[PDB]
Design a protein around this ligand. Sequence first.
Ligand SMILES: O=c1ccn([C@@H]2O[C@H](COP(=O)(O)OP(=O)(O)O)[C@@H](O)[C@H]2O)c(=O)[nH]1
Ligand SMILES: O=c1ccn([C@@H]2O[C@H](COP(=O)(O)OP(=O)(O)O)[C@@H](O)[C@H]2O)c(=O)[nH]1
Ligand code: NA
Lengths: 291, 291
Amino acid sequence: TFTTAIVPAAGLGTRFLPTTKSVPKELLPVVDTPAIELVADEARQAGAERLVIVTSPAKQSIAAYFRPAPELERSLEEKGKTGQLAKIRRAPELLEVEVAIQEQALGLGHAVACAEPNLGPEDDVVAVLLPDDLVLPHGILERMAKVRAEHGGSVLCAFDIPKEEISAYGVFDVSDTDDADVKRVHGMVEKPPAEQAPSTFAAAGRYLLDRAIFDALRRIEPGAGGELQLTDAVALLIQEGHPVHVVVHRGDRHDLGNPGGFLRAAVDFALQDPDYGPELRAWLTDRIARP
Amino acid sequence: TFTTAIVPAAGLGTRFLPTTKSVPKELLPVVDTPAIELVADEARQAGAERLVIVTSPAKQSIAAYFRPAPELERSLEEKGKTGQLAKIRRAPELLEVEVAIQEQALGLGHAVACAEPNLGPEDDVVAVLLPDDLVLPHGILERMAKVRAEHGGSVLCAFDIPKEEISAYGVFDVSDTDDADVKRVHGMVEKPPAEQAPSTFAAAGRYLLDRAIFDALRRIEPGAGGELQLTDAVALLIQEGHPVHVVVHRGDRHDLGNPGGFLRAAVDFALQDPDYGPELRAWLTDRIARP
Ligand SMILES: O=c1ccn([C@@H]2O[C@H](COP(=O)(O)OP(=O)(O)O)[C@@H](O)[C@H]2O)c(=O)[nH]1
Ligand SMILES: O=c1ccn([C@@H]2O[C@H](COP(=O)(O)OP(=O)(O)O)[C@@H](O)[C@H]2O)c(=O)[nH]1
Ligand code: NA
């Protein structure tokens, strides 16, 4: 049981210039649907009632997407576009949405800290979903919530990636529990060489964090500019005997962080859509047989 | 010889809801570059010195895209990201851009009519580029200008589409000239059944229009709700003996009007981009051979 999910959405998306000069990265469509909607939908399916979106001053339009649009709805109703009407009603009815402002892009720990004013006394634990990761099928947070129910404390997420390929990620130092997909976390190493990787478990952008994380984020050594390393806040909770576990995702994943990975997501989803799939698959079938 | 290009961009992209509730269709990226920049570049490559973008009040932001971004530019300089800096300076430096408002989306003829106040004393001919078409590899307007230099009057654009796939388009009733890719236009049929199509030449969204089109757009019978169609204006000029020719494009084209056509564009470009091609091709080889 968490009721509040936090989405850190305050980057620029340099890798998507020049589009992200004018469009927030999180509003970019996967086929026809903004990435932020796909992440809100995952959060709702795992039981979120509220979504706190952390954004920069210039990207406040992310949240405006989740507000009703009576005029557009009326216009669409008047033209009998009932299918398109349902699509625009979906995000505003998923859950309650609020914005927290991160004044400057000081990193992920700082972003999470910026959400604390939006929490209530009922928020003993909060979900955190990074919008550049899609984790499929939906439900990693449900597996994580079961871990929290049995062990208390905080829960993280990993992908299983061979050591030869993991050096770009944070890698957990782990030991076994009674469940093979659930590991006790002793720590994390940033970007180990293959030979020094403590495991094949690479950190993924899903979190179920005890409310104690906020106090840990205030107690850690800030960075040069005021960057608060979420990883250091987790290490502090560990040192103070807070239970931290990880669930290993065994499904598919997509990385919306660069245009290449984004395009893979979009093709993957379009090919399953009966409106787009057949005609795109036939086109692709010929396109890739030629230069 | 034209210096002004008009881009009608005032539709809602219904086919891209729910994204187009918040993001103008014409700012959506093809790999990482907004559609509108690709169209602007085609215009500039045909010798346009000015872009008049016709848009709705809701979609004026398509304007800011073409403005300098000082703080963003300085940030990239400071980080030494010379290649990304060039990406964001490309659009503002392509050509002069201005905006004309279409208050309500009453059709393409009405949209073109909205750009008339932006014309100066030398705009005897104007280019029109529909932003949902890409004409590859090198556009077509330079070829159209040559036709206008030979014959006077106005020039249209067609794709060569088999009769059994042509029924979604306007189809020209034509006769031959000396040049196999230039036809004399006698008329245009809307959405003929295959067996009735007067040719395989489907109307494409490029035009080189004599200034006389604005008077034709004033004299044609408005629609049920005030919809002027460019079609009726062209037919009226033809009736009055205005010469109308069409150039048949034989190269490639993309349709950015729907999510399917848009992804085909993105995959086409990414496969030719060395940053994505080889790996994307293999990904695609596997992906299309499974549901
Ligand atoms: O809510 C957030 C999300 C990210 N970031 C930071 O902003 C950058 C993320 O940029 P993004 O994820 O948009 O990717 P880019 O394309 O800019 O590299 C990194 O420095 C993150 O630490 C942040 O401060 N707040
Ligand atoms: O500048 C323009 C461009 C289009 N339209 C009209 O708007 C509709 C098309 O909208 P759009 O091209 O965005 O496509 P959609 O996704 O809505 O079908 C057609 O009736 C066009 O004639 C318009 O009034 N002004
Ligand atoms: Na560019």
